[PDB]
Write an enzyme that holds these catalytic residues in place. Structure first.
Site, PDB file in Angstrom:
ATOM      1  N   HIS A   1      45.425  60.709  34.139  1.00  9.32           N
ATOM      2  CA  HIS A   1      44.279  59.805  33.991  1.00  9.32           C
ATOM      3  C   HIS A   1      43.082  59.998  34.932  1.00  9.32           C
ATOM      4  O   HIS A   1      41.935  59.953  34.488  1.00  9.32           O
ATOM      5  CB  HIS A   1      44.725  58.337  34.109  1.00  9.32           C
ATOM      6  CG  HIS A   1      45.495  57.827  32.929  1.00  9.32           C
ATOM      7  ND1 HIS A   1      46.876  57.762  32.903  1.00  9.32           N
ATOM      8  CD2 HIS A   1      45.074  57.345  31.735  1.00  9.32           C
ATOM      9  CE1 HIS A   1      47.266  57.261  31.744  1.00  9.32           C
ATOM     10  NE2 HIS A   1      46.193  57.001  31.018  1.00  9.32           N
TER      11      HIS A   1
ATOM     12  N   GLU B   1      49.084  57.444  40.145  1.00  4.93           N
ATOM     13  CA  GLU B   1      48.577  58.809  40.121  1.00  4.93           C
ATOM     14  C   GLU B   1      47.998  59.232  41.457  1.00  4.93           C
ATOM     15  O   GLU B   1      47.927  60.423  41.749  1.00  4.93           O
ATOM     16  CB  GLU B   1      47.573  58.985  38.982  1.00  4.93           C
ATOM     17  CG  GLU B   1      48.273  59.144  37.633  1.00  4.93           C
ATOM     18  CD  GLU B   1      47.314  59.102  36.450  1.00  4.93           C
ATOM     19  OE1 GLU B   1      46.114  59.398  36.644  1.00  4.93           O
ATOM     20  OE2 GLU B   1      47.773  58.784  35.327  1.00  4.93           O
TER      21      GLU B   1
ATOM     22  N   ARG C   1      40.371  28.077  32.754  1.00  4.84           N
ATOM     23  CA  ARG C   1      38.965  27.887  32.418  1.00  4.84           C
ATOM     24  C   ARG C   1      38.942  27.362  30.987  1.00  4.84           C
ATOM     25  O   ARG C   1      39.605  27.919  30.115  1.00  4.84           O
ATOM     26  CB  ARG C   1      38.192  29.204  32.517  1.00  4.84           C
ATOM     27  CG  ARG C   1      38.023  29.708  33.949  1.00  4.84           C
ATOM     28  CD  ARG C   1      37.410  31.095  33.978  1.00  4.84           C
ATOM     29  NE  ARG C   1      37.544  31.748  35.282  1.00  4.84           N
ATOM     30  CZ  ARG C   1      36.735  31.548  36.318  1.00  4.84           C
ATOM     31  NH1 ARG C   1      35.716  30.706  36.215  1.00  4.84           N
ATOM     32  NH2 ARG C   1      36.944  32.197  37.459  1.00  4.84           N
TER      33      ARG C   1
ATOM     34  N   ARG D   1      35.202  27.239  42.905  1.00  4.38           N
ATOM     35  CA  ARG D   1      35.425  26.400  41.728  1.00  4.38           C
ATOM     36  C   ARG D   1      35.177  24.905  41.979  1.00  4.38           C
ATOM     37  O   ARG D   1      34.643  24.209  41.114  1.00  4.38           O
ATOM     38  CB  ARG D   1      36.856  26.605  41.205  1.00  4.38           C
ATOM     39  CG  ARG D   1      37.189  28.040  40.776  1.00  4.38           C
ATOM     40  CD  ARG D   1      36.511  28.415  39.463  1.00  4.38           C
ATOM     41  NE  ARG D   1      37.062  27.671  38.333  1.00  4.38           N
ATOM     42  CZ  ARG D   1      38.230  27.934  37.751  1.00  4.38           C
ATOM     43  NH1 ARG D   1      38.984  28.935  38.186  1.00  4.38           N
ATOM     44  NH2 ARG D   1      38.647  27.189  36.736  1.00  4.38           N
TER      45      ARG D   1
HETATM   46  O1  LIG Z   1      37.085  33.531  41.022  1.00  6.71           O
HETATM   47  C1  LIG Z   1      37.522  34.666  40.794  1.00  6.71           C
HETATM   48  C2  LIG Z   1      37.601  35.742  41.739  1.00  6.71           C
HETATM   49  C3  LIG Z   1      38.092  36.932  41.360  1.00  6.71           C
HETATM   50  N1  LIG Z   1      38.539  37.180  40.079  1.00  6.71           N
HETATM   51  C4  LIG Z   1      39.073  38.494  39.682  1.00  6.71           C
HETATM   52  O2  LIG Z   1      39.259  39.289  40.848  1.00  6.71           O
HETATM   53  C5  LIG Z   1      38.477  40.512  40.737  1.00  6.71           C
HETATM   54  C6  LIG Z   1      38.007  40.917  42.118  1.00  6.71           C
HETATM   55  O3  LIG Z   1      36.763  41.645  42.033  1.00  6.71           O
HETATM   56  P1  LIG Z   1      36.729  43.243  41.699  1.00  6.71           P
HETATM   57  O4  LIG Z   1      37.253  43.938  42.950  1.00  6.71           O
HETATM   58  O5  LIG Z   1      37.608  43.461  40.469  1.00  6.71           O
HETATM   59  O6  LIG Z   1      35.267  43.572  41.427  1.00  6.71           O
HETATM   60  C7  LIG Z   1      37.385  40.146  39.738  1.00  6.71           C
HETATM   61  O7  LIG Z   1      36.839  41.303  39.103  1.00  6.71           O
HETATM   62  C8  LIG Z   1      38.142  39.269  38.746  1.00  6.71           C
HETATM   63  O8  LIG Z   1      38.908  40.014  37.818  1.00  6.71           O
HETATM   64  C9  LIG Z   1      38.498  36.188  39.106  1.00  6.71           C
HETATM   65  O9  LIG Z   1      38.887  36.370  37.960  1.00  6.71           O
HETATM   66  N2  LIG Z   1      37.985  34.979  39.526  1.00  6.71           N
END
Ligand SMILES: O=c1ccn([C@@H]2O[C@H](COP(=O)(O)O)[C@@H](O)[C@H]2O)c(=O)[nH]1
Lengths: 245, 250, 238, 239, 240, 244
Positions: free
Chosen positions: E5, E77, E165, E220
């Protein structure tokens, strides 16, 4: 010692095959005191044992401590030494409105709200009491004129959340047990305790005989009185023991 | 009818409060034949019901069909009609070497290898028989004289994979049940049958009394299958015991 | 007999490779009555069976009884005798307010609220109907002309608590099913029945073809037909 | 008493907010003896508590007994009296070949092969130690030179089958635990013990701090004082 | 490419043993540009990998994409290529009212609300971080002097339902998560994210050190990425 | 942007109600090219989206990324934007000896070896596809005359242990999956992929129609890693054409 915990050898049991198992070590001597030639055997951790005699038949009394983890050690090692029948005596609290203080409860099977039980058999397996033991207890209870209740008990790994208690430090009870007490009631469960799931599942799934009897010393829904309740429960178990020698 | 499936009314019961519930509708008439004045009440689908008298008391004999789903319906509607005590009589195949064909089995509780019991209580709850019902069966067996075994039973939702049979079309057993029979044997389980789990769990969790007795008609560990069909008189043996036991619960 | 429960020999099937499996044994004759050379074969327990001829080919009609356990037995033994296609025809209670009594329903897959299905495959495995079987059914519904709906069905081991009915002896429902109907409803489940999860699961994971159709007899919020359809669908799979 | 099991009152703690909690009651006094003004408080069943001073602050040493259910009563009740920090000291075996007797073990979190833990949090909740407690233990174990192993521990409700022992009355091990030890070994688990899973899950889900250290006294695939020294030293920097 | 990958070979790493794993491939370069000799190694699907040199030692930055599934491909990987220490840097949202935007969260262990972790260990196994890694990240946030909360993180497989949510197309949340956020808050859970449960569990059960730091970008109940990114590059220096 | 991850507005769909959704973002373009008036909309993380017209109707091609967590976001935000029918086009590892590389597999339902599907329905709920979508995919393949196999698929949250690949860093697979491939194989399961479980579940459980088709790139009964795709994609388009 032939076992890693109890501090007993088979010779200490003198061919005994039945053990009365209370939870509290202090109740051992008082149980033995009702049988013949009662003598102290050993005491290590929550495990204090005694041996007595019933109709010239060796009988032993051993405490199991609090919980299934403790109980599993005691049952396993007594089994190794030679015990084949286990009778648990203890006082409990009822969650059923028709079960009053002073009543005697004999457990047919238990709701497995513990963990050690799964170390012996999958959850689909019933933590059921042995029939002979149960009939011995039921009959010993009536011979004393006790008001008995033969049924299902809920066996929890906790004294608080698992018994849906909110008068605790956090005031919270994990989802799994929220509204759980009323469901047990609706399902006919008589009481709550903390060792029968393990005891009953261990034995029932390893060719051992086990039963349990308890005196009700308090009813959740609503000093010297409790005194007599335990005295009768103990009376019930020693008499049931005589029939199972 | 007062119930949607059985085609029965409380009147039909004439005050009965105890039911003998076999699995085969064809066997209802035979159980009823061990009692006085048996009358056929009805027959709809898997549920064939008869009424008889035992020591002058009304008793119901009604087939449950194969499995807990069908069993839960019969029991449920019978309870609405007044029945409070259920005694199940069945045939079985033992999984223990020492349990011989022709012996009688009384069940203290069952391994819940079904799905309907979960419709009345979570897996943690025990599928245990009522004490009085088990007492009547053990005592009656003594009155009759059969060789009796009392203990745990494995109640399976299937007749083949759940009881680890490989003599099937596909010839395979899903991971969960692979080597499961050897496990139940090791745990001291006596036999396999298909309705106790549901029956015991739904009655024990709803203030109803239930018993379970069966006649071993075959042994999974033995090589020779039950002597012809006359050896299957064990059915008639267990039947008499279930009827005698009802007497003490009236 | 070559099977322990049905009381049928391989020859009784006369080479049949498909079977309409209704739940009620008293409805088996009616169905066979719609085809040719209808002959009663046997009747044991909840399994009454008839053989018939459709388009010049043998077809079996066999009742399964109520539930997956009884169904799992009929399907296994019928498979042992050669049947490779199973068309189930039943009754049912719609749980969608837009589905009316008298309408027909074809199941694609079912919610596994049973237990026998676990004896053939873990709960991850889907209880999905066979494509050619679903198609025949959808097709036959068009020809026979009926208000049809194609979707997900909830298969329950009980008729009362599992379908969240309260007018029972205890009047209570165990936590798992408390408020479960509104949930199935919001997820677009069409109806409640008691054999598909087992029928569908066991055939899907054992190289057997299965289809599921059912006539609505009641709406939880409000035979000749679905039978004609299953017979018509059967001729499309011979 | 203020609590139903330990026979104690908030008054008895003298404001203490930290408790060292061993299993065996017998070990309670020996531990309090290494501190200041050690005084017996109570003893009811396996719950015998002592109260001492460490650098001017009161600390409680209370036994829990064997198993999580027993542990669960002491923690809860000790927390009701005000305890906010828990430090479990113990001795243990080891399922890894690179751990030798006399070695010190610091658990960062543990596998939940218990049941009491499920009464506080879903199985998906991590039975994780408190970072500050774990730090204090490692720094303390480092201060005396004890060769330390920091990682995961397997916390079992049973001493026999849960630890896949066949030397028993039945010589049987239920399917769930058949071939499990080697699994835990492959995953790097260090040892088996019986109260950590309960202790760690109930503290991490109720705003309480927990840590655990244990000295290796036996090795299946093949020191008590040190361990004790390390837990008091650690308790020192978390007051 | 001898790794299906990522399209990377053993030599592309230059001996690297540590890897910084952000979730967004667009963040890779930025992180890599914080160290010497930033070189692009490749970019396939959600995985854009770069090589850098920290204190004379080769370091790798490789995006994982969203979720435990894609993360398990990257981690595996990269481990096949020789990586043993993994540091995930992310942006997140706290679920505790006492956590403000711009705060740095260090994860000790994760609530396993994902599904890929179960492919490495039974639910009972703890999605716990590596001690060294965790200590490093903690010390780095201190040296940088930024607000730091060290605790448990709820790692969900979805962004909406699993994090409870309701402002979604359907507006309904499956029973399992109905009321789940309140629960997590009372248990002390600091926030939600979607990769730690898989990362932490697949590393702790295979002998690979893993840590997780993140900056709060939303709350939140109501510089950050830089601080988060700087801390993780600083943390890596200690784990080198 | 109307959504939080795709960087799109309801206006960008131009009334599109169906979305062809591949896994590889570098494949959205190859798929849009096969249609009328292709236009690139946006590229954020693993979600690169394009728009096209099929028979005078707008259609969207939006990559989902690897796994259900990434997919659930795509489907959820695209649904919010107005999409109602999802046709997934993917690659896959066949577990049956008779399936050849390049063969087209239409999935009727998937084994939920994922975790995100549990976020929409309990495990008892079937990860089943829409009948119309499956019908269109089956017929479109027929229209082309491509080797097609219709059946059940095994969808997991991992590419290695979950699909029982031993050629890895640890070389071991947790108990849950030891001897699992042989099980699925014996149950008639055709292949392994990584998003259909979440896709089919979240859609079937929220009133969204969904289809699933993939191209075989390896046969697991012979090897873990490989050394006609045009057909699979031609099918997902022709199929989409019948669903507008
Ligand atoms: O309130 C939040 C904080 C983080 N995340 C998840 O944690 C990841 C952490 O950021 P990244 O490193 O993926 O950009 C987000 O992309 C998301 O998938 C959420 O869903 N909600």
């Amino acid at each position: 010692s032939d076992v890693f915990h109890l501090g007993l050898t088979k010779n200490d049991l003198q061919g005994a095959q039945l053990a009365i198992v209370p939870g509290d070590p202090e109740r051992v001597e008082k149980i033995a005191a009702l049988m013949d030639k009662p003598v102290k055997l050993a005491s290590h951790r929550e495990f204090t044992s005694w041996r007595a005699e019933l109709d010239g038949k060796a009988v032993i009394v051993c405490s199991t401590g609090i919980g299934g983890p403790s109980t599993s050690i005691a049952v396993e090692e007594l089994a190794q030494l030679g015990i084949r029948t286990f009778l648990r005596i203890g006082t409990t609290g009822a969650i059923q409105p028709h079960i009053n203080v002073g009543d005697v409860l004999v457990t047919t099977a238990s709701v497995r709200l513990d963990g050690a039980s799964l170390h012996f058999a999958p959850m689909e397996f019933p933590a059921v009491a042995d029939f002979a033991c149960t009939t011995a207890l039921v009959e010993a209870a009536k011979s004393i004129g006790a008001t008995t209740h033969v049924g299902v008990t809920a066996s929890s790994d906790t004294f608080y959340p698992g018994q849906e208690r909110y008068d605790t430090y956090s005031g919270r009870v994990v989802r799994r047990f929220k509204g759980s007490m009323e469901e047990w009631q609706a399902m006919g469960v008589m009481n709550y305790e903390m060792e029968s799931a393990t005891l009953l599942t261990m034995c029932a799934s390893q060719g051992l005989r086990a039963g349990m009897v308890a005196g009700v010393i308090v009813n959740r829904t609503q000093a010297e009185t409790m005194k007599q309740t335990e005295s009768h429960a103990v009376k019930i178990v020693v008499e049931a023991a005589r029939r199972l020698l």
